[PDB]
Design a protein around this nucleic acid. Sequence first.
DNA 1: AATAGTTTGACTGTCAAATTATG
DNA 2: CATAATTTGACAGTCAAACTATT
Lengths: 146, 143
Amino acid sequence: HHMDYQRINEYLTSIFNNVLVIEEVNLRGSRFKDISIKEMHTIDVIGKAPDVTPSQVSKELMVTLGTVTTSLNNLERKGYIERVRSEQDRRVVHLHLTKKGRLIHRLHKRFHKAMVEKIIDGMSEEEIAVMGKGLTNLYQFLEDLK
Amino acid sequence: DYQRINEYLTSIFNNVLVIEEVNLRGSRFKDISIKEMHTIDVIGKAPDVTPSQVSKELMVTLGTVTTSLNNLERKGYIERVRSEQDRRVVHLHLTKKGRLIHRLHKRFHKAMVEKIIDGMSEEEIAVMGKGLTNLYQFLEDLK
DNA sequence: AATAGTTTGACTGTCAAATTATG
DNA sequence: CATAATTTGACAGTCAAACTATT
Ligand SMILES: CCCCCCCCCCCCC
Ligand SMILES: CCCCCCCCCCCCC
């Protein structure tokens, strides 16, 4: 039997209203207290893709380049990232995480890992495989709606 | 693999916000953010909710709520009414316009969710339901 | 002393527009 | 002229702390 729509709606509403606040609260209680969840997203892009450029971070985060530049200025000032001028094209900037950046990037991954482990709690390996297919299908449905 | 589950969850979450934003900005209510829609929905679902209860539900400070409520009240979506039993207390209620957008928003969400469920296999729905429950509980356990 | 709500000052996140340098 | 980035201007949204009013 399907879940009641009322319960579905209730769960989705809690999740969408609170998930970014809960993630921010977890970072603010960490040993690094000067990084917001939005800055953590910028850190995340750079950590996964060393030498990425501001333009690529912009496309990946779906905000304008001015917005990315401001965030990078705060993050460089606070010691989490370094900007490096390209030697091929002198218009281009390559970004990479400082050691401090790598440390907090790791910490944000433990959170994501705890979340996925709770998501699959009680599921068998075949249910997990089905859940994987469910997510790609839900993802694909939403992609086609924009 | 946990990292790619995470990649899908983030893209899904991000797509949902994009789709909500486009539907809002394409509507006849062009002065309402996604966050204000959330506040309207809290008040619509619980008539006479107080600012403190809104603050608890959305997990923002009360001052942030007051500011938002001033904006929504100015723009014609909500009304504040002082409690007759305790005059420190404010009860919130949607205006006619607030009920209209609330009703249109609930319909939009229901249709979309039903459409999504319609395209899934019985086994997908069983397990997506269990993951939704678990995700809800993960967050609820951190509050 | 306590509680519910508001106001205030500062800062982030965000986009558009104007700007600097480079191709 | 196009591209990559930055800076500026102008707004929401947010928090912490101070304040007001009421119990
Ligand atoms: C508002 C659109 C996002 C909703 C997608 C989530 C749907 C969850 C369905 C779970 C099925 C449980 C029965
Ligand atoms: C920050 C991303 C986590 C929130 C993702 C919510 C998406 C809702 C999909 C529900 C299905 C879960 C199995």
